[PDB]
Design an enzyme around this catalytic site. Structure first.
Site, short mmCIF file in Angstrom:
data_model
loop_
_atom_site.label_atom_id
_atom_site.label_comp_id
_atom_site.label_asym_id
_atom_site.label_seq_id
_atom_site.Cartn_x
_atom_site.Cartn_y
_atom_site.Cartn_z
CG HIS A 86 -36.13 -27.48 -6.03
ND1 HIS A 86 -36.55 -28.57 -5.29
CD2 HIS A 86 -36.62 -26.39 -5.41
CE1 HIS A 86 -37.26 -28.14 -4.26
NE2 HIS A 86 -37.32 -26.82 -4.31
CD1 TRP A 87 -40.95 -25.08 -10.53
CD2 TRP A 87 -39.78 -23.63 -11.78
NE1 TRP A 87 -41.78 -24.02 -10.83
CE2 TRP A 87 -41.08 -23.12 -11.59
CE3 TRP A 87 -38.86 -22.89 -12.53
CZ2 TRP A 87 -41.49 -21.89 -12.13
CZ3 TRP A 87 -39.26 -21.67 -13.07
CH2 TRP A 87 -40.57 -21.18 -12.86
#
Ligand SMILES: [Cl-]
Ligand SMILES: [Cl-]
Lengths: 286, 286
Positions: free
Chosen positions: A265-266
């Site tokens: 998610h990054w």
């Protein structure tokens, strides 16, 4: 070129919101003609700086003025309890900061919550946006394939209620595809930001109690966006399902979607170089 | 720099296939330590030169030797009736040409049938490939969401059976998102390549009659691929469903997927500039 620093670029400004006045923090970098705003995610201990540490310099070196807004409820900004749209709230603050600095147009790089906020901002004030870049966020809504609340959001919500080191590790362990990428500096900075502002953590939880759906579903209005948009997502994002990226792609005409398979998610951090290169290329388009 | 011409780069080589010897044509462009092989699609009248006309020069200028192979059954190459695996036939031919040209490694850009072929080649000779770029193709298999045979494929098959200008326009009309792109020149060259070799058209239909499944489903083996892979697709591809791109993405470790929303089945052409930029950047990674 001398790499930018937090302390040197740190700034404050007051913003009127719901009758009350709150002190808002943000980092102002470079001086370029074109400005690029970077909006952080909603993780505990998150700030504009810690979220975009790996993407700031390539932007400034390229000649862009870079502003990293710390949304209320995070960082050095005042805290707040949001019982309405979190997305529109941040968009309102950015609007004030942008008007006060007398900045006409801005490019947006929104991360997770920042993505939702960038879409909200573009929806409200289209004439004030150049290009839009969304990563891991952008619109509220249901996933068509992945169970919700997601594996990640559960750990993020748990960490917020119990700000312990163990929960920070539990959450970050599934935040990125290859944890070998998480650095101690990174970890320590978050932890420090977490514990140094318990008012934020407490108000985040309260905001959820007051209103469980912090992010509106902009699905039906995506046809309104005329900004050239670039969506970035990790195939293995355990916090926000990848098909959310597919929705954004289908709704915004002329958009493009770039998905990193081995990514959580990054992406802006996990695949920094590929990311900074996609962004610079995108931002340079006519 | 002078743009490449099909006439100047035209070449031939003999390849032993199934006990027979067939004359294979291909365009050899530029010079450079690294070589990039471009494999064309399966449309009637398709050739390496016509498929990649907007990608050849940026490739050569970046410093790559570019080989455009016309697979048997297409272009100036001998024809053939294939009742076996199309992807594997093409990879064999390329293997012969590449050995005959004394080329150690190659980067691959496979378009539709070409993608299936590049994966077949990469699966068999992983040591001979550098980077892998797939566009609108790569693995057989069923779509999860789109009806098959697809809208596009029904028209491609119809064209092969009845090679008429009407059917060519009909196929092309839904081949790209913005038909305003197609040029009279492109169309005429297509028509010429089509009507020129009716033996190819006839053998394509015969091959289909001999073997309905020309492309094997490489899904289960995708984990064998170690090549850095880039997958490109058009969200509005009416010939090969976009979720096929998602399958390639999930199956090939370390891969990346870039989807163009307003794009049909020919992204290298429809979004030539952005595509070339993506590929050049990709090809330049360590
Ligand atoms: Cl975050
Ligand atoms: Cl084709």
């Amino acid at each position: 070129y001398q790499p930018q620093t937090e302390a040197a670029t740190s700034r404050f400004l007051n913003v009127e919101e719901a009758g009350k006045t709150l002190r808002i923090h943000f980092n102002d970098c470079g001086q370029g003609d074109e400005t690029v705003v970077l909006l952080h995610g909603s993780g505990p201990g998150a700030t504009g700086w810690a979220n975009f540490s790996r993407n700031i310099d390539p932007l400034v070196e390229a000649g862009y003025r870079v502003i990293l807004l710390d949304c209320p409820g995070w960082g050095k900004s005042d805290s707040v309890v949001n019982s309405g749209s979190r997305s529109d709230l941040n968009a309102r603050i950015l609007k004030s900061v942008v008007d006060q600095l007398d900045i006409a147009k801005i490019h947006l790089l929104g991360n997770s919550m920042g993505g939702h906020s960038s879409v909200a901002f573009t929806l409200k004030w289209p004439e004030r946006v150049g290009k839009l870049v969304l990563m891991g966020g952008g619109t509220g809504g249901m996933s068509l394939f992945t169970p919700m609340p997601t594996e990640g959001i559960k750990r993020l919500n748990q960490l917020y209620r119990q700000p312990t080191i163990e929960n920070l590790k539990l959450m970050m362990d599934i935040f990125v595809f290859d944890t070998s990428d998480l650095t101690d500096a990174l970890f320590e900075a978050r932890l420090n930001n977490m514990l140094s502002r318990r008012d934020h953590l407490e108000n985040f939880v309260k905001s959820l109690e007051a209103n469980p759906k912090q992010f509106p579903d902009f699905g039906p209005r995506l046809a309104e966006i005329k900004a050239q948009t670039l969506i970035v997502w990790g195939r293995n994002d355990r916090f926000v399902p990848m098909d959310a990226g597919l929705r954004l792609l289908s709704g915004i005409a002329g958009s493009e979607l770039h998905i990193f398979r081995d990514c959580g998610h990054w992406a802006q951090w996990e695949h920094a170089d590929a990311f900074n290169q996609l962004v610079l290329n995108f931002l340079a388009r006519p």
